[PDB]
Symmetry: C3
Subunit: 178 residues, 3 copies
Amino acid sequence: QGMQTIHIGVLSASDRASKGVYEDLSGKAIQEVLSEYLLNPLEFHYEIVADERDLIEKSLIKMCDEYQCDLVVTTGGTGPALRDITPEATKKVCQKMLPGFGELMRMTSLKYVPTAILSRQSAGIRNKSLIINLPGKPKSIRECLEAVFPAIPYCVDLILGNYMQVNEKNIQAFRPKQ
Amino acid sequence: QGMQTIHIGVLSASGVYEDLSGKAIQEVLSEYLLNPLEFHYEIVADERDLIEKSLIKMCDEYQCDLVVTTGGTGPALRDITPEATKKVCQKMLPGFGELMRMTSLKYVPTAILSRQSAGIRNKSLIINLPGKPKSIRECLEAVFPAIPYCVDLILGNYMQVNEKNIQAFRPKQ
Amino acid sequence: QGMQTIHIGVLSASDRASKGVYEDLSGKAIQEVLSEYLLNPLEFHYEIVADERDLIEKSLIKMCDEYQCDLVVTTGGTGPALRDITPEATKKVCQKMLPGFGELMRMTSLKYVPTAILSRQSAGIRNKSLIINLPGKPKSIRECLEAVFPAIPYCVDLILGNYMQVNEKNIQAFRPK
């Protein structure tokens, strides 16, 4: 009856030439939110990676394959600009993409900003891992996770990842029966 | 003056169960169309090459104007119906996938996990549907109003809609 | 100082003659709308090409690479019919696609007509150019541009295109803090 440990990858894509300090804010927001959403013992695998496609692919692959993360989330590099290559790297290492995540994350942001439709944030499956691209700003990250997390535990179940147990005080997750 | 026969392919991707899904599909489509209908119904195992082969037969040999699948459209490993669909289609129609997810998202948050799509193969429209009767009706209710015109444009047979049951819409040509 | 000139590409996909004498109506609608939305001096680069994928590809590439267009828009040929190959050509010349534009354009039209979901209109980036597929008719074109234009100046900023100065009397465009 012991809850399974959930391994979670947190990948910050950054050239480290814009933020200076506060380079950890987005990652900290990610860990805070997921820590409140899950009852499981959690182990976070955090890495800062330059905006180089192959490096991001390698990092994602390591988090899924070596660290056995059930969930891997990225922050940064998901707009129309030249070095925003995080969605491309994500698509390359996933076997199946889940367009519904990209749709909902834009719809969620589109409530606030018209430029939400510029986002290329996506999600996909690599083996027993769900990878999702998150926004860059802590407030945006929270709103995004609040919107998409209710579908995540069931998704992780279906791809045969470990069994997330939701803190229902903070978020609701739906699991279809039968 | 005679209505054209519409050929409709029904592909169930998956034997102690009733195919409530297959029945739901034929029931709903029979309510929505006035035409004489011929259903080409097949059960196929969750193998990509086999689903591709079945889709190809329904479009090419049976000359189906509309082909619908049920099953195998989630994130799980053996859910390969959307892959098979993309393989046999020349054009995909992302609007269908968007609307089907938006429709289901009204009721369950896990709707965003669906990879259901739609595309064109020659004169056939192929659409991936859900797995349960209730969700199938909700799905068809949402996307059917656009189907007759789509079939018109790809040069399929002319569907005559039962307006009592579903909205008929063809834009000004 | 003064405003930068915005270069705009307009590509009409036309299988020669089904329109008749109406051959020009879509591109003018586009010209009128953008002239109303932007304060910048504008230079349009217009071309009609046959419904052949390679020709449309070459034309888009010319507008982006040679005419240095900040915005490139196409009209027509984005439905399910066989010869509607504009989105395929668009995808081929773009480096990144922007699915949010396609979603919004379909949702906008869906408030009007159920057959909006048949559209394969898309948008994407080629270097410093934003390319967007627009509808075929003047009415739909205005409705489409009205919906998507608020996101365009900022997108063009991000891809290092010229700086659009919006006529805020006619349209509002968002640039985040």
